[PDB]
Design a protein around this nucleic acid. Structure first.
Length: 348
RNA sequence: GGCCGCAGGAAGAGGAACGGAGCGAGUCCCCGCGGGCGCGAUUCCCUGAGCUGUGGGACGUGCACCCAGGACUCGCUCACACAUG
């Protein structure tokens, strides 16, 4: 099996009924586990849900999917992620990080759904500040997390308030604003921070010294992805039409610009293949766009999962499975239900 | 209750300004206090899923905050007052 967008993705079971419990609920992305065992979904009800990979794939009609875990947070969930080095063969690796409004960075066990650990970030007044982003290091030793004008680096082995603080803004110079996303280069010893203040920043892993500072985007940056090459990477923003392609060589200016309809203050996700050839992105209109990265990325396909915003898109690391999360904020007036969905993208 | 031992007294009950106040300084106590406020221009940006329009931020800029008390100690001032049947 291998990815192929020469044909439109075939439908595979999704979940709609449980999200319809609350009025005006909507999904806030979806993320495959790095081994490909299960998929994690955030929602406006502040409930992380884990769905197992469908048994009926390996076993035609599929039943509505049911989550093996529901792990409830008490406030808006800003970011969430799988452990970098997760495998379902090891209970010690299978866990989910999660940050929430005025709460610690919770670590949830991905089998039993219990609160396993808590990392706590305090300001100079000894008041708890919540992390707006999360990212494990490629070794899985450290947990990087973004705040206003600063990244903190907790050691995964020692859960608590202990952390290395890294200021990105010093005496009105550097990367300003809430750091909304962190991502590491597969090859290089660096990481990239996006901010709700328009700019991107590159930083060395060991020291946290600035390598570069990049403009480009016309809105607050929401997501980052490094290509498996290590040189090339991509970025996207809120209320901003362009998905910008970058390169670590020939730096300072984005090489290409890829169009997508983003008309809300949302984290509209995008994701690459495991091989790195295709790039998939959601849209506020709903249309999931696909580009072949191998020159400018060529448009391959556009299709519509539903008549609503496609906020989340996630590609499975081994199988040709596209996951799609839907929904958005409805705006009132003075006096369609959201859903996760799977899609087979394999060849004929 | 009685007896013995030890200890404190060997007591006639005094005194209608005694010995005070208010400031200032030094030293302690108290003591989570770069943040708070305003205006200007590209409506200065922003209904962010980021607190937030009963407010949040950026850049100019200016502005006002960081005490007041108490205790001890050494000055200056005002009294040294039993309150008029």
């Amino acid at each position: 099996w291998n990815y192929s967008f020469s044909q439109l993705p075939r439908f595979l079971s999704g979940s709609w009924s449980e999200f319809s419990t609350q009025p005006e609920n909507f999904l806030k992305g979806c993320k495959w586990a790095p081994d490909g065992s299960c998929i994690l979904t955030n929602s406006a009800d502040n409930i992380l849900r884990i769905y197992n990979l469908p048994p009926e794939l390996y076993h035609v009609e599929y039943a509505e999917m049911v989550p093996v875990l529901r792990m409830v947070e008490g406030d808006t969930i800003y970011d969430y992620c799988w452990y970098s080095l997760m495998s379902s063969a090891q209970p010690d690796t299978s866990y989910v990080a999660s940050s929430s409004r005025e709460n610690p960075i919770h670590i949830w066990d991905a089998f039993t759904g219990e609160l396993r650990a808590s990392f706590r970030a305090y300001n100079h007044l000894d008041e708890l500040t919540a992390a707006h982003s999360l990212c494990f290091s490629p070794d899985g030793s450290q947990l990087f997390c973004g705040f206003n004008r600063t990244v903190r680096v907790f050691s995964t082995a020692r859960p608590g308030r202990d952390c290395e603080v890294r200021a990105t803004f010093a005496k009105k110079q550097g990367q300003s604003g809430i750091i909304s996303c962190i991502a590491f280069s597969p090859a290089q010893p660096l990481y990239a921070c996006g901010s709700y203040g328009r700019s991107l920043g590159l930083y060395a892993w060991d020291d946290g010294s600035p390598l570069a500072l990049l403009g480009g985007h016309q809105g607050g940056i929401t997501h980052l992805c490094f290509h498996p090459d290590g040189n090339r990477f991509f970025s996207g923003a809120r209320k901003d039409a362009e998905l910008l392609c970058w390169d670590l060589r020939q730096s300072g200016y984005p090489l290409w610009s890829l169009g997508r309809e983003v008309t809300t203050n949302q984290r509209i996700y995008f994701d690459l293949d495991p091989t790195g050839q295709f790039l998939v992105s959601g849209s506020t209109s709903g249309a999931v766009s696909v580009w072949d990265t191998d020159g400018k990325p060529e448009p391959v396909l556009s299709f519509l999962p539903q008549k609503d915003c496609t906020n989340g898109v996630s590609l499975h690391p081994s199988l040709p499975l596209l996951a799609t999360a839907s929904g958005q904020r409805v705006f009132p007036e003075p006096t369609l239900e959201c859903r996760l969905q799977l899609w087979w993208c394999g060849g004929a």
